[PDB]
């Protein structure tokens, strides 16, 4: 069965709209058909991405929400 919460892809909705570097990265992204193959974690997503865009801003965008998904979570299952 098909799960796709669509998380990320949640996350950087808003700037596919107006001419941002954010948002080519989302336009890019949903060019492909979106099916899931084997996600599972986070950092093979980077490692994907990274190999396949050489621009600085399309991977730093990645790689930034997936740091925030990551510590932004932790520490808001333990916050103060």
């Given at each position: 069965m098909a799960g796709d919460p669509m998380t990320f892809y949640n996350?950087?909705?808003?700037?596919?709209?107006?001419?941002?570097?954010?948002g080519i990265l989302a336009e890019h992204v949903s060019e492909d058909k979106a099916f899931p193959r084997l996600e599972?974690?986070?950092?093979?997503i980077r490692a994907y991405v990274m190999s396949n865009y050489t621009?600085?801003?399309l991977i730093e965008t990645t790689n930034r929400a997936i740091?925030?998904?990551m510590a932004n979570l932790?520490?808001?299952h333990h916050h103060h």
């Open positions: 996350f950087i909705m808003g700037f596919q709209n107006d001419n941002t570097p954010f599972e974690r986070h950092q093979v621009d600085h801003q740091s925030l998904y932790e520490h808001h």
